[PDB]
Amino acid sequence: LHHSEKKYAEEDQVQELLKVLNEISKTTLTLDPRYIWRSLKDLSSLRNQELLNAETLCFTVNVLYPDSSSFKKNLLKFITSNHKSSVPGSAELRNSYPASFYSVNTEKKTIEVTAEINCFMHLLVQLFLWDSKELEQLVEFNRKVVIPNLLCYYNLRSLNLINAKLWFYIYLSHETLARSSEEINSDNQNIILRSTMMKFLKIASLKHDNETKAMLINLILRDFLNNGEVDSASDFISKLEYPHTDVSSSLEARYFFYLSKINAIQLDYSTANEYIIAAIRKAPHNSKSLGFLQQSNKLHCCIQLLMGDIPELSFFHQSNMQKSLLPYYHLTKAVKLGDLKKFTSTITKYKQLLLKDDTYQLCVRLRSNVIKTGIRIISLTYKKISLRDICLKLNLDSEQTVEYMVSRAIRDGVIEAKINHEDGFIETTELLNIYDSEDPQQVFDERIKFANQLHDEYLVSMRYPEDKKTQQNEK
Amino acid sequence: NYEVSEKAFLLTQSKVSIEQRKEAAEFVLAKIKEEEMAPYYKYLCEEYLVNNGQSDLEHDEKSDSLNEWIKFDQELYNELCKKNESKIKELNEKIQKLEEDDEGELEQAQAWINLGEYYAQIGDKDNAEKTLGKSLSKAISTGAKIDVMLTIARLGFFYNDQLYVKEKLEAVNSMIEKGGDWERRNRYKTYYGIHCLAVRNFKEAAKLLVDSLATFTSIELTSYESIATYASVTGLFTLERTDLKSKVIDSPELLSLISTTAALQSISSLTISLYASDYASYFPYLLETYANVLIPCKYLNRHADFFVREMRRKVYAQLLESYKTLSLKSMASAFGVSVAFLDNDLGKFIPNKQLNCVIDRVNGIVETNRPDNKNAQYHLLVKQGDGLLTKLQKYGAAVR
């Protein structure tokens, strides 16, 4: 019973291992194993639950263990090990074959098979930890191991794609430990985590790995927003080390999401409004990306309201996620009509929901945008309007108060009007008739290069596959 | 069965007179004895509440109503079993003998079709489609194809379903496509625009209503004055003033609908005032159109305020096109409105980007905004760049 369960999963694990084993040996095929490793994460997670945990026990006995003897026992110690044929050396699948890692040449240390075996061993360990939700001592123990091992080994172009997915598990397992319980050991542990990211980033820049730098930057930018340090994030994004070529669309959408929140508090929403749009377009529409689409859609509505523009209501209607968008719908109506009591009562009841995503601090700026938008509505519809006519609509304080609020928006060119104190009425200074001016021409010259932007990123991609197509023999 | 749902619809919201519900109650009491309304009769209190919806003697026992004839009694309870035995059980054994004796094929299919109409009389939608399902395989010509659609068409008017109805009508037309006369084609067309009134598709509902003939009468599915109201009234909100002259105000048919039935007062009082450019008396015509037409009709209660407000936006738009400016005393006074109420009408029209104009206070001059040389090469042309930029790189960025 238990014997047939251990040999079935290990045969499938070696079958998937031998595929990427022969591809990295000859020249550089590394683009091919990258596609296999995408499905390896999903195929291993479903396989971990079946055949209990014993698939990883016999796999270590098969190959040679540099560090991995005590790590399995320590992993099996927390679960109250049940020992069945647990003596090392019970299952031997090698039997002296070249693809089986021939034992005599391996045990005599005349050849080194550890490079591809050890780096692949750490990948399967991190998968069971996140699947079984094992925390506390097992999180810190594995962090003290993998990090020193990566500094000793020299990662080639193919080897840099191994640990690239291991950096995600180091940061994820640490954040789940901090949110579960807070202590003095959690703050000091994050200090080393921030120090290790800066040392390996320089090494990854020399190898010019696209997936490695894409995974690091996404994890590094998130740490900056947790501590709230702009000076660290501002200088980091100025280098532009993030390759846009071979990175996946899921890694791109996460990159544009960070830039929207950085420029939001910098009071420049012109560039931030495009970053939140690019994050949605690059993110897939499937169910696994709903976690990113839920947060990105909530940030888009916050960016618009801070610009003075009001987003469309169909976004809160035709979508299927509107159940979570209900708190942001009441903020849409309160800004339009300019009601002061409606905005104060809206953020009071939903304050509990706004604390989770930390968007309640951005709602403080919305208190000013309620009046700024109401002035824009009445100024565009009414060209020449008196001074006291505004205070009778929005129920403002006095005539001197509204005079200062109108002169505030003309700084950035929002209202585009003038205040005449002698005559005592505000007149709109926009006569339109800009068709004869050169202002539309500035956008025209930019849209000429926008069409050519997709031209240089495309024609190259046609010949990209054609090499291996024409090199293979055709019938 | 639409005659019951049309009259009993007044039991929902009546802001004018209670006698409108009492007069409509005579049709509900008369038709319930001939055909059992029980699914819709119970659906009256289960649809809308806090008017007549709190009066039931069966599910929840309470009384709040302006009409006391919606309550169950011992007569409807006995007739419920009598209609099930006489119209179904008696006729089901006769068809069962035909299936055992193996007499004909299409004749047996028409037996379940004719019997399926009795399930609509007793108000059973589950067995109505079950009887037609057995005759669906034997259906060849349009004789048995349309009869299946008839029951599906009853789901929309009788059971108030805008979803599962229009989906089945598109499947029947894709199976055998002939169309017969205009009335058989309007069942795939006029009814399609009726379901679009619920989801508020704007012109998509009135596309097939204008081309539909005014002679279409389905009786149980719809009446003569029912299609006459949905075709004439909806076509006014959709077609602009360019199409109102050669279609609405001048028609060989529509002009005969309001002439026969004087309760419309839509294509006449509204179009003549827009053609004569007299807006002083044009405003009270909207009240008679809203209260006595839009409210009492069933599918015209979905939009509610979206009707008159769209006309209040387009009534000034016609005046803006004929003058470069406008006076305050001729608008906020001579038209019957006031200064504060006119400012509230046009206050929300401009920021919605539906139209463009200029309003003044001291001078009181309403100026019309014109595109001049901008037109579609100013915004739409610039918007066209980013409109085709995203959809072009959407499938190109994913490669395979």
């Binding site: 469309e312 209501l313 719908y329 | 305020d305 407000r309 929300k348």
Partner: peptide, 27 residues
């Protein structure tokens, strides 16, 4: 799709226009 469907107005229903019939005779 902006300032259209659910927000609506909550005015311009009855009491506002019902008074306008009296203003015609007051001039």
């Amino acid at each position: 799709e902006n300032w259209d469907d659910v927000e609506v107005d909550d005015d311009f229903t009855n009491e506002l226009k019902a008074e306008l019939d009296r203003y015609k005779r007051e001039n």
